[PDB]
Design a binder for these strands. Structure first.
Lengths: 149, 58
RNA sequence: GAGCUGUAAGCAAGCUUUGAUCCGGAGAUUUCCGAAUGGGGAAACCCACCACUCGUAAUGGAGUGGUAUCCAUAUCUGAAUUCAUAGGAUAUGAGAAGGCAGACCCGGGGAACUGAAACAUCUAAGUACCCGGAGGAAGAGAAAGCAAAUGCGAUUCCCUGAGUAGCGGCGAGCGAAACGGGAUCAGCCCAAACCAAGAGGCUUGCCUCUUGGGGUUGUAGGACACUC
RNA sequence: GUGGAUCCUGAGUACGGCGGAACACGUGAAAUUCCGUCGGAAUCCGGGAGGACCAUCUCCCAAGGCUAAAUACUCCCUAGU
RNA sequence: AAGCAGAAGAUGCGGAGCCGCAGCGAAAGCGAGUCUGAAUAGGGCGCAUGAGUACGUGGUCGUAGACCCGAAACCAGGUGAUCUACCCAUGUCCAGGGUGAAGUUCAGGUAACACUGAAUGGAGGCCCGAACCCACGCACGUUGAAAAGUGCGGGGAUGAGGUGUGGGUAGGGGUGAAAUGCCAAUCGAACCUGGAGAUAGCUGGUUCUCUCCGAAAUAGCUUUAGGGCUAGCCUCAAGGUAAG
RNA sequence: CGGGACCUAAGCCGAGGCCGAAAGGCGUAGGCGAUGGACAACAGGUUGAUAUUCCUGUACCACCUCCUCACCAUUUGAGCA
RNA sequence: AGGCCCAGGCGACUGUUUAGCAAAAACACAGGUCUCUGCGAAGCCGUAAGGCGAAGUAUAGGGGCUGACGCCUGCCCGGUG
RNA sequence: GAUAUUGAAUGUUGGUACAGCUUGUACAGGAUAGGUAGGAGCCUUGGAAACCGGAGCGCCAGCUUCGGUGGAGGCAUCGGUGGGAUACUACCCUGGCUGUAUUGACCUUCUAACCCGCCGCCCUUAUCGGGCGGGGAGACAGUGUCAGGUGGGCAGUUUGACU
RNA sequence: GCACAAGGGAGCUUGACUGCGAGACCUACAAGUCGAGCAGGGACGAAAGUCGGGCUUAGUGAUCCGGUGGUUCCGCAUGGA
């Protein structure tokens, strides 16, 4: 009666929630055609395996993401002058793509879709802070160095 | 009326009423006609509820 | 090693010491029915198809051999729906069937008469009878036993236990076993653990399947480390 | 043959309710075996039996198979009473 | 004893086993005592007044068919619808003569329709009556020609008809225009074999001779009344012995 | 001539199958099954026994070609069914 | 190769039955009535497959009762169904 | 009828613990006298009656827990109230309900079982059955085990003796 | 059969007892009946001595099975059940 959920089926549950449901609702319904597999069956082991695999993979991935959040940290000062003119004014346009450009200045590349700064950055030249926000699971520590033209 | 997985079939026993009067009767197993495998070929064939209880293939 | 072609008494006839008749072992022929099986059928018959022969100017006719069903293996095919399976086609099989000894053994099914001085529990009796299955014998079998002791050690059968202990409208009736004494005497093989590989699905052993090591054990044994 | 960390030692099986049958045993204290329906265990610190049932003790390891001789019987054949 | 040797024998071995020598009590249990009982009282039980065992003949009993012949009938497995009942398929038979339906034609009739009269027409589980089938009356026959007929009369005879051939329905059944009718001369449940030598408190019968003794037909109880058990009466033996 | 190698009714059997304690019951494809349908010889003779069967004269039916003549085309195909 | 007539019970009529004692006032009958059944009808045989009912469909089938035709068929649902 | 085949789903619905229940009504009567483990006991600005009133509890007593004109308000047997006036463990609910996992009936669904003596195609020159598809029904029915009722349709038997 | 109370009245009391029972009657068996006398405790009475139900004869039934009370009995390896 216990069976691997396989997929998500309303009250039935979601893939991974293998449960002991009544027969018929299973053998004569869910199992036939629908997602199912019977947790009691040896397949349970296959399930455990694939599941643990994926989980560990993704978790370690998020871990290494916090890891490179640290990775890019010791970074050499970002020297991308934003055309500083008339004092604080910066002819250059500062926004997130601006930040990522100041970035690829040796080789490595990123995605402009990860910036973390609610307000747009005042077009200054000071310690432009850039809290890299790759993924929710891991943000980062950074402050690029705006400059004058 | 046989079962193709086990030797279940009708057997004879005696009906006994009050005053223990003996009358010959029969006892039928709980067969069901159901669509299952016998070889890798599928088929519709008899089977008992007890046999089905041990999780056989449909 | 001398009369013989029976029963049976014939002469119209022929065979036999170049070994008969006769007796034994092994072979060949063994028409037609009969499980009967090419098809049919009212036993002892009728009509076929295919291959090859006899025969006709050819048709007609004849001879020999195959052609039942189911089951096993292999091959080809594999509708609908042309993944794929039923299904179909071909070939290979001292393969089954049916009989039997009115006996014996397993089972499946299973009466009444009768006894009870009627009768329904019961008895007759799991007998008669029907059905399926093999054997020359079958069932049984090496302990999840018997038994309560400075204990016995597979089953089977004979005497004994005993008409006892018991069961029973506590009636009618039914009715053991172990200890003991004999005949006979054989103990073994697996599944599981783990090793090896090859077995792919991968969700990297969770399952394969074939071997072998691995193994058959209760005051436990074996995998597993230490022994030929 | 010594050791005994870990693992295996027959699951819809044993066993129970229900209704039957065989055990000499007629449901009775009814142990034991099997059948049909339903329910349904444990794994050696474990299990079963010793005539309801419990405890201690004693014996034993089911849910897998094979196993001759002693035994039964004559349609027969041979030689005999 | 089984069993092992032994001419299917005797005999040898075989002490497991069985009956007595001790009984009482339901039993624990005690023991020439024991049970009951508060009892060292009384009473019951073999005390004390010690032969049984193995085998053979004979009488009788118990289980076996049990002394032999006899049921109607029950149950299991089969064989029969060539007779008969019904049904299905397909053929076939019914001399001859009457009655005269329905429609239709003509004529009249009516506005038209009804209707009226002829002619034609040919229907009937119609009529009379041979073949055929049935079986109402009488006679004969009744160890018959015949295990159901013959003789003379009767009924149906175009129909719910008779009948041929090939088939189906099988006995805790089948058929039945319905009588308990028929199912192979058998039917309130066919026939054949088996259980089965059913049982029979009932009827019959039960075989050579002589001798000794010699009854009863009654009481009680009985699903008991023509059966049976005990008592009375008979007989045989061992005792008490002189009771009668 | 009647019946076979021609056909089918009732009914029967029945490959696969459906059901059933076992034997078996039922039944599709298919087959069997005349009492029916289709189907070419008849009138004289003859012995002791047979006669549309034997003989006589005349016939008819199905099929075959060593043969004969009349015709069509041997793929804008004659013929066969 | 008809005897006939008058009346009356019973049965409307033709028909059928106790082969082998009883052929009738008994059975049947068309007619009438009650009731069941919506079709894998009901009812029936069989365990079941299968059937008949019926290759039919409430103007049709099954069952009970009465028996042409004419006039009629009154009261009681306390009891049994 | 129960159970197996045999379930999905909403609503109507027994439990198990989570938030807690109040004056916890003797004729009498300050409010409505069930647990006197401190009954002689404090609280610490922070709003009281509050047009009128409480989910609630009495044949309309009000209560304490708070609400659309509420910033200090106060019982304990003892001015006119008695038995233990129960005032700072955490009472059993005086027995009340909400949100949470389980059980029965009415509902409708379908795949999805099971059924189809309905239709189209194929197996297949087959009105058998069986493969697919469609359609109808449908967790019912049928069938298996058990249980009750009915049941001369059927079976084995009894139905005394004297006279 | 009873007026010597077995009839009538009063007080006290529960022998309307337990264990039994020499003998005898009656009897097919099953049963039925009487019984002095002994022991333990009583009731009555001072005592003697009476009391083991009605003044004598009817007012009642087998066994099996089951219920209830007491048991210094047995209780299937042992202790319990």
């Amino acid at each position: 009666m216990k069976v691997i959920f396989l997929q998500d089926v309303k009250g039935k549950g979601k893939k991974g929630e293998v449960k002991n449901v009544a027969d018929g609702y299973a053998h004569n319904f869910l199992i036939k055609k629908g997602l199912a597999v019977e947790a009691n069956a040896s397949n349970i082991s296959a399930l455990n395996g694939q599941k643990q695999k994926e989980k560990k993979e993704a978790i370690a991935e998020l871990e290494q993401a916090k890891s490179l959040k640290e990775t890019l940290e010791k970074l050499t000062v970002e020297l991308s002058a934003k055309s500083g003119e008339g004092g604080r004014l910066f002819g250059s346009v500062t926004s997130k793509q601006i930040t990522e450009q100041l970035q690829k200045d040796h080789n490595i590349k990123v995605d402009k879709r990860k910036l973390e700064l609610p307000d747009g950055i005042r077009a200054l030249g000071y310690t432009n802070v850039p809290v890299k926000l790759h993924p929710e699971v891991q943000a980062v520590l950074k402050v690029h160095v705006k400059e004058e033209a | 009326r046989k079962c193709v997985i086990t030797g279940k079939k009708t057997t004879a026993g005696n009906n006994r009423s009050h005053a223990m009067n003996a009358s010959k009767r029969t006892w039928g197993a709980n067969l069901q006609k159901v669509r299952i495998l016998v070889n890798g070929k599928p088929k519709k064939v008899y089977v008992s509820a007890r046999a089905l209880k041990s999780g056989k293939v449909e």
